[PDB]
Amino acid sequence: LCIEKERDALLEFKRGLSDNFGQLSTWGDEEDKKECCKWKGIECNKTTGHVIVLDLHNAFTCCFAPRLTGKLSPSLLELEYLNFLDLSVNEFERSEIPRFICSFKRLEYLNLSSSFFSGLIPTQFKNLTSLRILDLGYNNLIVKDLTWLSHLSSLELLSLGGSDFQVKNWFQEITKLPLLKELDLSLCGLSKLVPSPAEIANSSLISLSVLHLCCNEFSSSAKYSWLFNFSTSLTSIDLSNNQLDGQIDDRFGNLMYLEHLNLANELNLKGGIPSSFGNLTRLRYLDMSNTRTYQWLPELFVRLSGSRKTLEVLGLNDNSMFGSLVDVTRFSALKRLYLQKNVLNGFFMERFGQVSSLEYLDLSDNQMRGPLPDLALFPSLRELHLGSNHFNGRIPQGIGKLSQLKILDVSSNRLEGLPESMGQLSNLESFDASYNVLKGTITESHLSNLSSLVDLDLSFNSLALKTSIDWLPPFQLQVINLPSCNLGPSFPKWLQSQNNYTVLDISLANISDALPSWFSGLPPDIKILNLSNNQISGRVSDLIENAYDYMVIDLSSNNFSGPLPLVPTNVQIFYLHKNQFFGSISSICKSTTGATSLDLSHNQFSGELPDCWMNATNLAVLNLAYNNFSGKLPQSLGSLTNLEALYMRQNSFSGMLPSLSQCQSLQILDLGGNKLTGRIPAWIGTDLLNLRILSLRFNKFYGSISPIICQLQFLQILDLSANGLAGKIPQCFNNFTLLHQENGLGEPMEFLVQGFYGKYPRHYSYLGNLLVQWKNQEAEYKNPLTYLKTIDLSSNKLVGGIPKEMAEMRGLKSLNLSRNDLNGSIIKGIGQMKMLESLDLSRNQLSGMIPKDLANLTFIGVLDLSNNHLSGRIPSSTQLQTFERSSYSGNAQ
Ligand SMILES: *[C@@H]1O[C@H](CO)[C@@H](O[C@@H]2O[C@H](CO)[C@@H](O[C@@H]3O[C@H](CO[C@H]4O[C@H](CO[C@H]5O[C@H](CO)[C@@H](O)[C@H](O)[C@@H]5O[C@H]5O[C@H](CO)[C@@H](O)[C@H](O)[C@@H]5O)[C@@H](O)[C@H](O[C@H]5O[C@H](CO)[C@@H](O)[C@H](O)[C@@H]5O)[C@@H]4O)[C@@H](O)[C@H](O[C@H]4O[C@H](CO)[C@@H](O)[C@H](O)[C@@H]4O)[C@@H]3O)[C@H](O)[C@H]2NC(C)=O)[C@H](O)[C@H]1NC(C)=O
Ligand SMILES: *[C@@H]1O[C@H](CO)[C@@H](O[C@@H]2O[C@H](CO)[C@@H](O[C@@H]3O[C@H](CO[C@H]4O[C@H](CO)[C@@H](O)[C@H](O)[C@@H]4O)[C@@H](O)[C@H](O[C@H]4O[C@H](CO)[C@@H](O)[C@H](O)[C@@H]4O)[C@@H]3O)[C@H](O)[C@H]2NC(C)=O)[C@H](O)[C@H]1NC(C)=O
Ligand SMILES: *[C@@H]1O[C@H](CO)[C@@H](O[C@@H]2O[C@H](CO)[C@@H](O[C@@H]3O[C@H](CO)[C@@H](O)[C@H](O)[C@@H]3O)[C@H](O)[C@H]2NC(C)=O)[C@H](O)[C@H]1NC(C)=O
Ligand SMILES: *[C@@H]1O[C@H](CO)[C@@H](O[C@@H]2O[C@H](CO)[C@@H](O)[C@H](O)[C@H]2NC(C)=O)[C@H](O)[C@H]1NC(C)=O
Ligand SMILES: *[C@@H]1O[C@H](CO)[C@@H](O[C@@H]2O[C@H](CO)[C@@H](O)[C@H](O)[C@H]2NC(C)=O)[C@H](O)[C@H]1NC(C)=O
Ligand SMILES: *[C@@H]1O[C@H](CO)[C@@H](O)[C@H](O)[C@H]1NC(C)=O
Ligand SMILES: *[C@@H]1O[C@H](CO)[C@@H](O)[C@H](O)[C@H]1NC(C)=O
Ligand SMILES: *[C@@H]1O[C@H](CO)[C@@H](O)[C@H](O)[C@H]1NC(C)=O
Ligand SMILES: *[C@@H]1O[C@H](CO)[C@@H](O)[C@H](O)[C@H]1NC(C)=O
Ligand SMILES: *[C@@H]1O[C@H](CO)[C@@H](O)[C@H](O)[C@H]1NC(C)=O
Ligand SMILES: *[C@@H]1O[C@H](CO)[C@@H](O)[C@H](O)[C@H]1NC(C)=O
Ligand SMILES: *[C@@H]1O[C@H](CO)[C@@H](O)[C@H](O)[C@H]1NC(C)=O
Ligand SMILES: *[C@@H]1O[C@H](CO)[C@@H](O)[C@H](O)[C@H]1NC(C)=O
Ligand SMILES: *[C@@H]1O[C@H](CO)[C@@H](O)[C@H](O)[C@H]1NC(C)=O
Ligand SMILES: *[C@@H]1O[C@H](CO)[C@@H](O)[C@H](O)[C@H]1NC(C)=O
Ligand SMILES: *[C@@H]1O[C@H](CO)[C@@H](O)[C@H](O)[C@H]1NC(C)=O
């Protein structure tokens, strides 16, 4: 039975507020909304409709809060009877607290916290003599006096947090509150306001049970000593983020009735809990996270033995702790245990036989040893984390008795098997056992009733999953990571029932079956598809479909055939090498693509490269090697601003290559074995400042090697063998940096792709190394030896002599100047070379006598000086005599 005056007042209050988030929507002048009892946020007395509770609060959803923004109209005074006013996280006019709140005459609850109220506290709050709970904390209020607090003699809770606290004699004022029981002075300085012993003596008797004293820069035991003389009645004590240093006070023991001790995020709590804590017998929550305890765990548990039957949640994570966890079932009341990221180095043994009550256990990111305990003694575990440890032995058969586990992570251990009871789990939403040993075979019996599995990760184990035919899986799992798992000679037939997965990883399996017809279309939202290193055959033309969340498509090392699959818009890495594709790739830039890496090597494609690459903006690696293309290179190859590596070796192109002047940030450019023609590009030296690998072998070039090529100053590989070049060898090889510092190494040649792909979040991070890719590619050419620092100018019409500047070169590991026409004597000063492992100067018109310094070379592996007009008396050295007669043949010495 609402009073029309109160309803009009409420409407007037609403008029001044801009409720832009749907709150206060039930309010209004409409006829169907007349009765104010169902009006949201409003409660009324049944005998008479006077408003009692007005709680327009909100909450943080993750931050973000659906805050109101208006102005407190003074019409609320018409309510005349309310005893509850909650404005908890709203942001009204960022001004002083309204001065009419003092004239309510019946309030028993005021929560103006977590707003942006500013200014001082009005002095009229002395009229609020009937309050019981006051919460003005975490505002922008500035307090300098507390004389009003004396009149408010009926409070049981006071929270003035977040204030610019400057009241020096706060203890005297607070102690004048006989009925006070909870005090929140968080983030209020209070380290510069320490009551003297005279002030403490000149104080009344108050039994404060709960204290919130966090975010105060105490940093010492003497600053907070006063709380220890409310010892007769204390229940909860929060002292987090005070930068405390030294041993925790021994007086925290013998502090009976304590049920909570938040000591999170201190500086150095050296030594951990003292011997005085064997007297507690009532502890229920002890958080000592991020405090650097360095305590022995059995000692910690024997010091907590008093509260064995009462302790519920225990912290002790992110701090140094050593020992072994033994006899945890004797607590019989512990519910949550977080011993992660410690320096534990012991076993995990029960030995006691009684049942536990753990619901959340996390022993991850530390060291453990020995087998897992009999897990049937934890029939209430909800989230078991045991990863990043050293756990051996088979997973116990009792794992099927949990019957309530949701997340199981046993990765990075040394587990040797997986039991058959795992199937009877019916709420396991995420199973992760990657990077274990896990030998054996998995039958459908291991997955019979896994009805709620949405994440299965048996990554990189010597495992074998072989499900019998006519098995209908009971789960529609989102993430399928099964690399290096034998999934049967045929294509796994349990994927037919799956039509919602977003990440699929069937790589490194053993599949030698043609692609099934039912594997037509992937689920619309797919992010990772890695079918690499298998023997799958068929056409993948009608499987891509151009989704919107594609990130990885790796179909490398298979027996695929047919036309090129479509390249989606949002893909970042597109790998297709080691396949049997054929046709034309003209459909590769028809749409805007954002691929960082594009691999089409070791295939049998054909046709001219389309003039399409103007649409490619983010290509960093383009590898079209060993593919038998033809025609002129596209003029759009210069539009790739962010191009790093370009592989086009062994493809039989033609014509003068186009300018890639805009292609700065280019590091690898190999075009060997094709039919490219023309003079050496002038733009190689001018632009391309970050070039390190340049290979142009077995092409139809000509002309002089222009000296500008010396300006690269990062070149470690220069391949110009069998190209028909002529003239004189450049006299500027010192200009190269990495071949002048002996053991110097260049900056890493890396590219990175990152993403998140799980409801239970997981990080996908691929780091491709260009130099590793070059090493892998070069294994196809030279079986004997390859080197990462090589200068090659063999088999050309070069004339003149070797300039006397390679003697100063230090880190060069290979040198091949053969089948040229070189006149004169070999470099006098060759002994200055240190890390030479190969040297060839065969088939040349060399004249002179081999210098004695050749004797003091050290690590030369292969040497050839055949077919030269040289002198005799080969130097008597250590490894020189180890070479055969072939290396010095064909000479008239
Ligand atoms: C005046 O008004 C203001 C309004 O602004 C009032 O202030 C509000 O008061 C209410 C109380 O009614 C508060 O709600 C309560 O919040 C608490 C705290 O929840 C938060 O912490 C939880 C625990 O976090 C630890 O543990 C987790 C792992 O479990 C870890 O990830 C955390 O990082 C943290 O870890 C730390 O501690 C570990 C163990 O000690 C250590 O190992 C570790 O190293 C760390 O040191 C957390 O679970 C919780 O998360 C919730 O929210 C997220 C996101 O929304 C969601 O995903 C989760 O699932 C959770 O839902 C919070 O981060 C909470 O414990 C209370 O729970 C009660 O209510 C629920 C209701 O269902 C019951 O089920 C519970 O059993 C329990 O009874 C309650 O929700 C509110 O937070 C607070 N808000 C503000 C802004 O102040 C004020 O009280 C009013 N004044 C007066 C006088 O009343
Ligand atoms: C599609 O799927 C295939 C198959 O799964 C992927 O190819 C494999 O990718 C993984 C992940 O990158 C590779 O595993 C890694 O190999 C690195 C190199 O291995 C050599 O060096 C190590 C150390 O010297 C030797 O022991 C080893 O025998 C090799 O000689 C390792 O260094 C990596 O180990 C590091 O990471 C793991 C996991 O974080 C840690 O546990 C380790 O302690 C260490 O820190 C790792 O093992 C694997 O080599 C690849 N195999 C093949 C055949 O390519 C494709 O990458 C995937 N496609 C895409 C796009 O992701
Ligand atoms: C420096 O580069 C030249 C080429 O630029 C390398 O010459 C190659 O050397 C191999 C090994 O001797 C030759 O193979 C030979 O093939 C014939 C058959 O034709 C066989 O009878 C020989 O026994 C030998 O296997 C290869 O033909 C030759 N390339 C040529 C002549 O074009 C040379 O090896 C490089 N030097 C170093 C140290 O690597
Ligand atoms: C735990 O509480 C007991 C008292 O219940 C403490 O014992 C006191 O101190 C010594 C024991 O070494 C004896 O004089 C008496 O047993 C007690 N003296 C009193 C009550 O005046 C015991 O010291 C406490 N534990 C710790 C570690 O201090
Ligand atoms: C680069 O991509 C753009 C957009 O994807 C292509 O331009 C569109 O091409 C389609 C297909 O022929 C036409 O239907 C649109 O009308 C085109 N729009 C515009 C604004 O041109 C473009 O053809 C691609 N580049 C090359 C060289 O083909
Ligand atoms: C409702 O009003 C009556 C008389 O005015 C009072 O006795 C009673 O306590 C009120 N109810 C509440 C919940 O305040
Ligand atoms: C507080 O109560 C006294 C008692 O009558 C009254 O005189 C005074 O005006 C009240 N304060 C305010 C701000 O109304
Ligand atoms: C309260 O305890 C402190 C801590 O030792 C002590 O110095 C002070 O004299 C005590 N005062 C009263 C009134 O109990
Ligand atoms: C000490 O206590 C007496 C007792 O009433 C009081 O009058 C006096 O003001 C107190 N001293 C201080 C500094 O408050
Ligand atoms: C577990 O699987 C068996 C085999 O069909 C079934 O009979 C049983 O009902 C399942 N348990 C459930 C659904 O709780
Ligand atoms: C796939 O799962 C998502 C949630 O993970 C759900 O919203 C969607 O409806 C599912 N798809 C189908 C076809 O049920
Ligand atoms: C599966 O293929 C790998 C490829 O390296 C091979 O080493 C392994 O022996 C194969 N296993 C079976 C069972 O065929
Ligand atoms: C797939 O290709 C490899 C080598 O490219 C070949 O050895 C294998 O026989 C091929 N598989 C089939 C089914 O033809
Ligand atoms: C020598 O090489 C450096 C390396 O960048 C270059 O800056 C310098 O101009 C070169 N000197 C010449 C080509 O005379
Ligand atoms: C050696 O060959 C070079 C070719 O330019 C040139 O110096 C000359 O023709 C020859 N003889 C001498 C002594 O250099
Ligand atoms: C190598 O030996 C020769 C001896 O003829 C010497 O002149 C030269 O300095 C040596 N090189 C070194 C020590 O690096």
CSV table of C-alpha atoms in Angstrom, one decimal, residues 253-384:
chain,number,residue,atom,x,y,z
A,253,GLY,CA,49.8,-16.8,19.0
A,254,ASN,CA,47.7,-17.0,22.2
A,255,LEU,CA,45.3,-14.8,20.3
A,256,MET,CA,42.3,-17.0,20.8
A,257,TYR,CA,39.0,-16.7,18.8
A,258,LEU,CA,41.0,-15.8,15.7
A,259,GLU,CA,39.4,-17.3,12.5
A,260,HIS,CA,41.1,-15.3,9.7
A,261,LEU,CA,44.6,-13.9,9.0
A,262,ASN,CA,45.2,-12.3,5.6
A,263,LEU,CA,48.9,-11.6,5.3
A,264,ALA,CA,49.1,-11.5,1.5
A,265,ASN,CA,51.7,-9.5,-0.4
A,266,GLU,CA,54.3,-8.5,2.2
A,267,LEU,CA,58.0,-7.8,1.7
A,268,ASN,CA,59.9,-10.5,3.6
A,269,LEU,CA,58.2,-12.7,6.2
A,270,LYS,CA,61.4,-14.5,6.9
A,271,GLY,CA,61.1,-17.7,8.9
A,272,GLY,CA,57.3,-18.2,8.6
A,273,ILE,CA,55.0,-18.9,11.4
A,274,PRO,CA,56.5,-19.2,14.9
A,275,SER,CA,56.1,-21.8,17.6
A,276,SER,CA,53.5,-19.7,19.3
A,277,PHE,CA,50.8,-20.8,16.8
A,278,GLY,CA,50.3,-24.2,18.3
A,279,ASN,CA,47.7,-22.6,20.6
A,280,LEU,CA,45.2,-21.3,18.0
A,281,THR,CA,42.6,-24.2,17.8
A,282,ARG,CA,40.1,-21.9,16.0
A,283,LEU,CA,41.8,-20.9,12.7
A,284,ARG,CA,39.7,-21.0,9.5
A,285,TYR,CA,41.6,-19.0,6.9
A,286,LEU,CA,45.3,-18.3,6.7
A,287,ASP,CA,46.6,-16.5,3.5
A,288,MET,CA,50.3,-16.0,3.5
A,289,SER,CA,50.7,-15.5,-0.3
A,290,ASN,CA,53.7,-13.6,-1.7
A,291,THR,CA,55.6,-13.2,1.5
A,292,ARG,CA,58.9,-15.2,1.1
A,293,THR,CA,58.3,-17.5,4.1
A,294,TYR,CA,61.0,-20.2,3.7
A,295,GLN,CA,59.6,-22.7,6.1
A,296,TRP,CA,59.6,-26.5,6.3
A,297,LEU,CA,56.1,-27.7,5.4
A,298,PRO,CA,55.8,-30.5,8.1
A,299,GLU,CA,56.9,-28.0,10.7
A,300,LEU,CA,54.2,-25.6,9.4
A,301,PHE,CA,51.6,-28.3,9.7
A,302,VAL,CA,52.7,-29.3,13.2
A,303,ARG,CA,52.6,-25.7,14.2
A,304,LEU,CA,49.0,-25.5,12.9
A,305,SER,CA,48.0,-28.8,14.6
A,306,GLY,CA,45.8,-27.0,17.1
A,307,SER,CA,43.3,-25.8,14.4
A,308,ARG,CA,43.4,-29.2,12.6
A,309,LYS,CA,39.7,-29.8,12.8
A,310,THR,CA,38.8,-26.2,12.0
A,311,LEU,CA,41.1,-24.9,9.2
A,312,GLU,CA,39.2,-24.6,5.9
A,313,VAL,CA,41.3,-22.5,3.4
A,314,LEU,CA,45.1,-22.3,3.4
A,315,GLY,CA,47.2,-20.1,1.1
A,316,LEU,CA,51.0,-20.5,1.0
A,317,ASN,CA,51.5,-19.9,-2.8
A,318,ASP,CA,53.9,-17.7,-4.6
A,319,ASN,CA,56.4,-17.9,-1.7
A,320,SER,CA,59.5,-20.1,-1.0
A,321,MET,CA,58.7,-23.3,0.9
A,322,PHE,CA,60.6,-26.6,1.0
A,323,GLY,CA,59.8,-30.1,2.2
A,324,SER,CA,57.3,-32.8,1.4
A,325,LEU,CA,53.5,-32.9,1.8
A,326,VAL,CA,52.6,-35.7,4.2
A,327,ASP,CA,49.5,-36.6,6.2
A,328,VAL,CA,47.1,-34.0,4.8
A,329,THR,CA,44.0,-36.2,5.4
A,330,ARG,CA,44.2,-35.7,9.2
A,331,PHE,CA,42.9,-32.1,8.9
A,332,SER,CA,39.4,-33.4,8.1
A,333,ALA,CA,38.2,-29.9,7.5
A,334,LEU,CA,40.5,-28.3,4.9
A,335,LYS,CA,38.7,-27.3,1.7
A,336,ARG,CA,41.2,-25.3,-0.4
A,337,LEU,CA,44.9,-25.6,-0.5
A,338,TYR,CA,47.2,-23.5,-2.8
A,339,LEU,CA,50.9,-24.5,-2.5
A,340,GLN,CA,51.8,-23.5,-6.1
A,341,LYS,CA,55.0,-21.8,-7.2
A,342,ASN,CA,57.0,-22.9,-4.2
A,343,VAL,CA,60.4,-24.6,-4.0
A,344,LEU,CA,59.0,-27.9,-2.7
A,345,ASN,CA,61.4,-30.9,-3.2
A,346,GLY,CA,59.7,-33.8,-1.6
A,347,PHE,CA,57.1,-36.6,-1.9
A,348,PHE,CA,53.3,-36.6,-1.7
A,349,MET,CA,52.3,-39.5,0.6
A,350,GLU,CA,49.1,-40.0,2.6
A,351,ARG,CA,50.1,-43.0,4.7
A,352,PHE,CA,47.2,-42.3,7.1
A,353,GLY,CA,44.3,-44.0,5.3
A,354,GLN,CA,41.5,-41.6,6.4
A,355,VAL,CA,39.3,-39.6,4.0
A,356,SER,CA,40.0,-36.0,3.1
A,357,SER,CA,37.7,-33.1,2.1
A,358,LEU,CA,39.8,-31.2,-0.4
A,359,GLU,CA,37.8,-29.3,-3.2
A,360,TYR,CA,40.6,-27.3,-4.8
A,361,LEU,CA,44.2,-28.4,-4.7
A,362,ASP,CA,47.1,-26.8,-6.6
A,363,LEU,CA,50.7,-28.1,-6.2
A,364,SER,CA,51.9,-26.9,-9.6
A,365,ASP,CA,55.0,-25.0,-10.6
A,366,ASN,CA,57.2,-26.6,-8.0
A,367,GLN,CA,59.2,-29.8,-7.6
A,368,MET,CA,57.9,-33.1,-6.3
A,369,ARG,CA,59.0,-36.7,-6.5
A,370,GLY,CA,57.6,-40.1,-6.2
A,371,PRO,CA,54.2,-41.6,-7.1
A,372,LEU,CA,50.9,-39.9,-6.8
A,373,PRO,CA,49.0,-41.0,-3.7
A,374,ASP,CA,45.8,-43.1,-3.7
A,375,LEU,CA,43.4,-40.5,-5.0
A,376,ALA,CA,40.3,-42.4,-3.9
A,377,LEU,CA,40.8,-40.7,-0.6
A,378,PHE,CA,39.7,-37.3,-2.1
A,379,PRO,CA,36.2,-38.1,-3.3
A,380,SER,CA,35.3,-34.4,-3.3
A,381,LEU,CA,38.1,-32.9,-5.5
A,382,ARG,CA,36.8,-30.3,-7.9
A,383,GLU,CA,40.0,-28.9,-9.5
A,384,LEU,CA,43.2,-30.9,-9.3
